[PDB]
Amino acid sequence: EFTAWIARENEGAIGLSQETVGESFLPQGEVTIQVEYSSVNFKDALALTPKGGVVREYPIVPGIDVAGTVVESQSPEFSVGDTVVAHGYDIGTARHGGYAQFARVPADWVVKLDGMSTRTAAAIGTAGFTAAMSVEALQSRGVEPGNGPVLVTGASGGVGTVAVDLLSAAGFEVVASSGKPEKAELLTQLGASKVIGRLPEPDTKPRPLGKAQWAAAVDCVGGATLAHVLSTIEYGGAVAASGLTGGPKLETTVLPFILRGVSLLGIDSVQYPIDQRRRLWGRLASDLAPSRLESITHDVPIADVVSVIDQVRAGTYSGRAVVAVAP
């Protein structure tokens, strides 16, 4: 038996509840993990919110990111003592995740760590992984430094911040767009050449093709922002669409695509194929490592997690929270 921090719904509200629990509580899987570290994401905070729309059904241990050490394995790909990261698929949303001393997952959902420490794996986590996919996607369509600035929208969120870091470190001129002026310095510290406010700017008349400004973009916002970005991408550029704030509707035109050769590349880390996921983590370990992430990382003891979750939900938390569970 071990300690798990279980989310439970009673009379409409949702509460994180520290409880001792046995083996039979864990979901089904070939690989059991002593969870060293986890993270706090907006998605983890939504799992502890009434109408959050993230959890299929309670009760559930939240924590979409799981990083730690294999204690038991019924799979020949993983040995005891291997360090691993597991994220995406059902983890922390439809089955028990990282906010517990132990977790169990299929081997088909597990990534083996090499150089990278478990703490770093968790610090990067789903958010940084998604940023890395966005960078690969853009590069997969010919985007290279020195044909203009790369825009990152919703830049202060978890994906945006790592994107700025990765793109700047790969030699792109990054312009970060954020609706939170208090975050401009942090974004600059992460490599933004400039920081601007929300898009479109209030005065702007929307056109099918507006003034070409951006060589590429990483979009974390969707809606009218994305529609505006598409109208202002340069000939042959691309946009990696990673996120949604507001409704899902997108009202655009086909003109940037057919007249400007623009590409819109949808980024999904949840169901990304495991072979590719493992490959990408290797990059995260090496050439795609976020160099300046540590400088905004803060260690949060699992016991103090509700405090951070609340600030993340309120949108007032600064930096990246890596949750110390069992280290």
Which residues 135-174 are close enough to bind its own copies by CB under 8 A? 137, 140-141
Task: Indicate which single residue of 241, 302, 309, 322 sits in contact with its own copies (rule: CB under 8 A).
Answer: 241
N- to C-terminal Cα separation, the chain? 18
Residue 152 contact, options its own copies, Cl ion, none, Cβ 5-8 Å cut-off depending on partner type: none
- By the rule CB under 5 A, 156 interacts with Cl ion: yes
Q: Smallest Cα–Cα separation from 255: which of 293, 308, 208, 296? A: 208
Residue type, 190: L
Tokens (6 digits) for 114: 């090499």
Residue 200 contact, options Cl ion, its own copies, none, Cβ 5-8 Å cut-off depending on partner type: none
Round to whole Å and give the CA distance between 106 and 94: 14
Among 35-43, 100-108, 172-180, 303-311, which window interacts with Cl ion (CB under 5 A)? 172-180
Ranges assigned E (strand) in 81-193 = 83-87, 102-105, 110-112, 150-152, 174-177
- By the rule CB under 8 A, 52 interacts with its own copies: no
Instruction: Convert residues 267-306 into a mask of x (bound to its own copies by CB under 8 A) and - (unbound).
Output: xx-xxxx---------------------------------
Round to whole Å and give the CA distance between 302 and 296: 18
CB of 44 to its own copies, least distance (A): 18
Residues forming beta bridges with residue 85, ordered by sequence position: 67, 111
- By the rule CB under 8 A, 314 interacts with its own copies: no
- By the rule CB under 5 A, 154 interacts with Cl ion: yes
- By the rule CB under 8 A, 119 interacts with its own copies: no
- By the rule CB under 8 A, 94 interacts with its own copies: no
In the block, tokens 């001393």 appear at: 101
Round to whole Å and give the CA distance between 85 and 181: 34
CB of 323 to its own copies, least distance (A): 25
Residue 154 contact, options its own copies, Cl ion, none, Cβ 5-8 Å cut-off depending on partner type: Cl ion
- By the rule CB under 5 A, 178 interacts with Cl ion: yes
- By the rule CB under 8 A, 58 interacts with its own copies: no
Which residues 184-223 are close enough to bind its own copies by CB under 8 A? 208, 222-223
Phi and psi at 131, nearest 5°, equal: -60, -45
Burial grade of 185 (CB within 10 A; 0-12, 13-18, 19 or more)? exposed
Task: Indicate which single residue of 112, 180, 260, 313 sits in contact with its own copies (rule: CB under 8 A).
Answer: 260
3-class DSSP state of 191:
coil
In the block, tokens 């020195």 appear at: 146
Binding footprint of its own copies on the chain (CB under 8 A): 137, 140-141, 208, 222-223, 226, 235-236, 241-244, 248-268, 270-273
Residues forming the site for Cl ion (CB under 5 A): 154, 156, 178
